[PDB]
Each structure stands twice: as C-alpha cells, then as structure tokens.
Amino acid sequence: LPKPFIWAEPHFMVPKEKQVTICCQGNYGAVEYQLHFEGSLFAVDRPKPPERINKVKFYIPDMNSRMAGQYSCIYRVGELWSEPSNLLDLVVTEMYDTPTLSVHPGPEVISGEKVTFYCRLDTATSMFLLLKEGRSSHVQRGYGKVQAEFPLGPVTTAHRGTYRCFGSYNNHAWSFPSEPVKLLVT
C-alpha cells in the first residue's frame, strides 16, 4: 500500500483555542483510516462509500496542550494495513508568556561575522525554539536555564531575515513568539 501522508491545516503551529484540521491521504478505495496520537487511538474514519475517497479530515475545534504532540495515520484495504505516515508534530503556541529575543554582536553585521541569538524566558522550561519567518521547517531548538543560545556560526546573506523565539512548557507546547528581530547581513 502506498505510505499515507499527514498534514495540518492551516498550519502545524496552532495558537491556543484556535482550530486545526489534520488531513490523512491514503489511497482511493481504502475502507478505514486511523489517526494515532502518541501511541493511542485518537480517531477512526470509515469512508462510505470508499471508492470516491483518498483522504480523511480530523477536526480539532479548540487547540490546547493536551492535543499537542506527535500524530500519525494508517489506512486499511481489506485485511491489510498501510505502513504509518511520517510523524506530524502538532504544536500549540501562545501559552502563558512572551520571551525576549536578543542578538550578539547585534542585528547589523557583515557577511563572515559570527552571530548568536539569545532567547530568555524565566517562567518556562529549559527548551527554546528559534524561528526564521518563512522557514518553519528549519526551526532550531536550544537548551538553557532561563535563556538559551543559538549560534549561527559565520553568516552570509542567506541568514538575513526576521527571527522570533519561543519558550516551551513541553516539547509541543510553546510560548507566545518573541517580538521579532531582523538580522541584516551586508
């Protein structure tokens, strides 16, 4: 059976109390889809009639930390189950508080210079995220009591852009985003 594909709409980073749909694309004619969450059965969809369906939607009306974590799906044709989809990380954001983002040496640098970002949030855990706007798949994770560092190394113009950081209350439960810091590389 083709491997199913799993994604979140509109996005996998969902503010608290906002909605998300988890989509699972299987195969036309598949008769049962399961959505798994962290090793448990979260929901089942049984397409009726199945011959017109290759994907199923699971709606979450009000996002919270108990529904944040890893999801996967599988589907069935006759007695045979597909292999699982890749894992979807569904993350709740805007939890509790707002961190401060800083940068060394500063926001304006020349190509070649080493840049470090710093994310501080005293009321959170030791795990922090650095997010370049536009590039959620390249989110960097850092570890530190009170604050974490994110060394970029020697930068080029590829590193130019707008950054925000998050503190975390668990792996999938993140703070409000920091105010943005623009990195200018000349």
């Binding site: 509109p10 996005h11 906002k18 536009g134 590039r135 959620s136 798949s137 943005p180």
Partner: peptide, 15 residues
C-alpha cells in the same frame, strides 16, 4: 473562517 498568525503568512509549510 481560516485564522493564521501574521508571522506564519507565506510560511513554507503551507507548501
């Protein structure tokens, strides 16, 4: 009724 935080507009995930 689609909601999206401004910082996620044009994010690569939406594909």
């Amino acid at each position: 009724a689609c909601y999206x935080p401004d910082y996620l507009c044009x994010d690569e995930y939406c594909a």
